[PDB]
Amino acid sequence: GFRKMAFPSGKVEGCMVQVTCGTTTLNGLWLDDVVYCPRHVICTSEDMLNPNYEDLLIRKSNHNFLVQAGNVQLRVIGHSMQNCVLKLKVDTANPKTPKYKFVRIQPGQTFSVLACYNGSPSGVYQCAMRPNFTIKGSFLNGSCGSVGFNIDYDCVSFCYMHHMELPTGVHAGTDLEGNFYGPFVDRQTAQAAGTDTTITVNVLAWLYAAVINGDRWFLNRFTTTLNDFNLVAMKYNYEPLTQDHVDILGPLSAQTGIAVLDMCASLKELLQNGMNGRTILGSALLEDEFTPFDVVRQCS
Amino acid sequence: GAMSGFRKMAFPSGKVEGCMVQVTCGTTTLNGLWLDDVVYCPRHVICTSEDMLNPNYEDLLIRKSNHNFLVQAGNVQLRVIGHSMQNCVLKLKVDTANPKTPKYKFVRIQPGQTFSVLACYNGSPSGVYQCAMRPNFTIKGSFLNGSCGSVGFNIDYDCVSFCYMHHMELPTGVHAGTDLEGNFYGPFVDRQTAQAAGTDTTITVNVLAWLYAAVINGDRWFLNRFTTTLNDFNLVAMKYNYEPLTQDHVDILGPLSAQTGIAVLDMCASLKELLQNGMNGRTILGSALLEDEFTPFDVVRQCS
Ligand SMILES: O[C@@H]1CCN(c2ccccc2)[C@H](O)N1
């Protein structure tokens, strides 16, 4: 009985708004007296290929920005651009503003996404930053302007904003300061995501989760050296494993008594021989969207 | 296409977050649902540690007065003014009506249908997940220590349909519970006596809708050229522990059948080949597993 969970989305729900520039409509994040949204909302049908965003920006008037929060309309006062994020300053501060911080995450860390359409929240899901810096999600998993977040002691950490739907069923976007995740541009040009890989630290964290839940058949008597594991793992499209990840797994190593490189011999053996029709925590597949600290959060 | 790399989503939990409270009777603390002037919670909050095998709820309840119930809404304390029992749900009338009460209904679901769960510690929401009422009337849930009182719901046009409440963890690691009228799902009792869940089965109708969703989005490698009779399909499915398929499930799938031009029974023959051959490393809609927790209602709603 181990299931993936998203954060309670209430505190982010009361921040989504609908931003409309000319013909284009998408989601905004209304915080204090500022609305954040992707900067490509200003792209016309003629600049949508090769725009000089800051010069296009300075020529738009505030009045070309429609902002509604449900039935209420918001007054745009000014606008500035920070990287690929548009910042529209409004006359009203959001009284539903949670306590928040802007953070940037690393490939392999998890967060929840509140999927929104035209400002209206539609659903919520947990995901991980893929090593190729993309996030799994169809057009039905929330369109441009939806945000990704973690909650740390009732404080929201916004880390992600959806910008564009890639052809491969994944989407890409930025942090809330506008910097893209991965080698992507907000220009409607042919663009492809790199070959993905399995988040190796997360699989080990998930294997520790099985051991906490008494699922133990995969554990063996063997260890392995770090790179004697890495060599085998990259041949299966697994992320190489750094000394940082080992340390991060330390606390789980101390609760279960399974050294990190011991569990690495279990996973390495799982890679070459498969699960032989057995199961771990109910799944015939290895999960890699549980960080070490999602396990400690949900198991302590 | 539309649903390439599609993920299940739980509904936004905000409207439920504003209804969760902490209910305490003596030494037990669990979650309550505060809707208007009444808070709902599982009745086994009034059990002691000796009462858990054969609790006499009617004896236990009548011995309790309003001021033995400790209802905490965040940082305010609510005053209990009345208290009655409807099956296994306890109902605490409070003097103060929840301002954050959403539009809501109480509905009972059938196995195979889906909803979201807001998992809570001590009145405090901890997470949200999307799941299905399994065919054996249990909920494969999170390894949360005291989720009792966590509710399940769907949301449809600002209106929250409450359909589940968590009462107990079973030895098999899944959860069992009631509707908001206190009737359990399945043959379970709110007693700490030996209770086992029947053998789980794959929600066949859900898989077929999922397979129809793939075909809508050009994912097409699993289709074959065969049809099957309904009863020839049902007979093979069962030795793979798949739910038998009823004519009603065939009708439910009819809209998917017409938009793709693939007869339902043809899709059943394609499924039957997937069972004898398997998905060993291959993907359907980005998933390396056959999804059985996405209903035909959400497929046709989301793929018009
Ligand atoms: O999940 C656990 C298991 C079941 N539950 C319980 C307590 C008293 C009588 C019957 C059931 C307990 O409070 N919570």
CA pair distance B303, B218, nearest whole angstrom: 13
Burial of A300 (0-12, 13-18, 19+ CB in 10 A): exposed
CA pair distance A84, A40, nearest whole angstrom: 8
Strand ranges across the sheet with B69-73: B76-78, B69-73, B20-25, B28-35, B38-42, B89-94, B80-86
Q: Amino acid identity of B171?
A: P
Other residues' Cβ atoms within 10 Å of the Cβ of residue A205 = 24
Q: Is the CB of B169 under 6 A from ligand 1?
A: yes
Q: Which helix H or strand E contains B297, and what residues bound it?
A: helix B296-302
Coil, strand or helix: which one is B258?
helix
CA pair distance B291, B288, nearest whole angstrom: 9
CA pair distance A187, B72, nearest whole angstrom: 52
Structure resolution, Å: 2.8
Helices (H) and strands (E) in chain B, counts: 7, 13
CA pair distance B169, B150, nearest whole angstrom: 12
Strand partners, A238: A198
Q: Which two tokens stand for residue A227?
A: 């790179």
Which residues are CB-neighbours of A33 under 8 A, at least 6 positions away? A89, A90, A91, A92, A93, A94
Burial of A187 (0-12, 13-18, 19+ CB in 10 A): middle
Residue pair A154/A129 in contact by the 8 Å Cβ criterion: no
Cα A152 versus chain centre, distance: 16
A282 with B141: Cβ contact below 8 A: no
Q: Which of A190, A205, A196, A189 is nearest to A251 (CA)?
A: A205
DSSP-derived secondary structure for chain A: -----BPP-HHHHTTEEEEEETTEEEEEEEETTEEEEEGGGG--TTTSSS--HHHHHHHS-GGGEEEEETTEEE-EEEEEEETTEEEEEESS--TT--EEEE----TT-EEEEEEEETTEEEEEEEEE--TTS-EE--GGG--TT-EEEEEETTEEEEEEEEEEE-TTSEEEEE-TTSPBSSS--SSSS---PPPP-B-HHHHHHHHHHHHHTT--TT--S----HHHHHHHHHTTTB----HHHHHHHHHHHHHH---HHHHHHHHHHHHHH--TT--BTTBSS------HHHHHHHH-
Q: Is the CB of B41 under 6 A from ligand 1?
A: no
Q: Which of A112, A111, A145, A181 is nearest to A35 (CA)?
A: A145
Question: Positive or negative, the Cα torsion across B183, B185, B187, B189?
Answer: negative
Q: Amino acid identity of A182?
A: G
**Rama region for A88: left / alpha / beta (φ>0; ψ in -120 to 50; rest):** beta
Cα B174 versus chain centre, distance: 12
Cα distance from A44 to chain B (closest Cα, Å)?
Answer: 24
Q: Which two tokens stand for residue B159?
A: 């209106």
Tell me the CA–centroid distance for residue A57 and ligand 1, in Å.
60
Residue pair B11/B160 in contact by the 8 Å Cβ criterion: no
Residue pair A15/A96 in contact by the 8 Å Cβ criterion: yes
Among B44, B150, B178, B184, say which to mutate for ligand 1: greatest number of ligand atoms within 8 Å of CB.
B44
Tokens 């925590």 -> residue? A281
Q: Which of A234, A228, A218, A226 is nearest to A269 (CA)?
A: A218
CA pair distance A77, A190, nearest whole angstrom: 36
Tell me the CA–centroid distance for residue A120 and ligand 1, in Å.
38
CA pair distance B159, A45, nearest whole angstrom: 38
Tokens 């522990």 -> residue? B241
Cα A13 versus chain centre, distance: 17
Q: Please, which experimental method was used?
A: X-ray
Q: Amino acid identity of B283?
A: T
Helix axes B247-260, B264-277, angle to 10 degrees: 100
Among B27, B142, B147, B168, say which to mutate for ligand 1: greatest number of ligand atoms within 8 Å of CB.
B168
Tokens 């964290």 -> residue? A205
Q: Which two tokens stand for residue A211?
A: 């051991």
Which residues are CB-neighbours of B152 under 8 A, at least 6 positions away? B115, B116, B117, B131, B139, B162, B163, B164, B165, B166, B177
CA pair distance B186, A220, nearest whole angstrom: 40
Q: Which of A131, A268, A111 is nearest to A199 (CA)?
A: A131
Q: Which of B166, B74, B151, B163 is nearest to B118 (CA)?
A: B151
Provide the strand spans (E) within chain B.
Answer: 20-25, 28-35, 38-42, 69-73, 76-78, 80-86, 89-94, 103-106, 114-121, 124-132, 151-156, 159-169, 175-178
Tell me the CA–centroid distance for residue B168 and ligand 1, in Å.
5
Q: Which two tokens stand for residue B57?
A: 């709820």
**Cα dist. B201→A258, B172, B244 in Å?**
34, 15, 10
B19, B25, B41, B44: the active-site residue: B44
Coil, strand or helix: which one is B105?
strand
How many Cα atoms occupy the beta-carbon half-sphere of B179 within 13 Å? 13
Q: Which of A57, A52, A116 is nearest to A88 (CA)?
A: A57
Strands B159-169 and B103-106: parallel
Q: Which two tokens stand for residue A239?
A: 């992320």
Q: Which two tokens stand for residue B270?
A: 């394609």
Tokens 């056959």 -> residue? B290
CA pair distance A211, A214, nearest whole angstrom: 5
Q: Which helix H or strand E contains B251, and what residues bound it?
A: helix B247-260
Helix axes B230-238, B264-277, angle to 10 degrees: 30
Angle at B85 (CA atoms; ends B82, B89), nearest 5 degrees:
115
Angle at B187 (CA atoms; ends B183, B188), nearest 5 degrees:
70
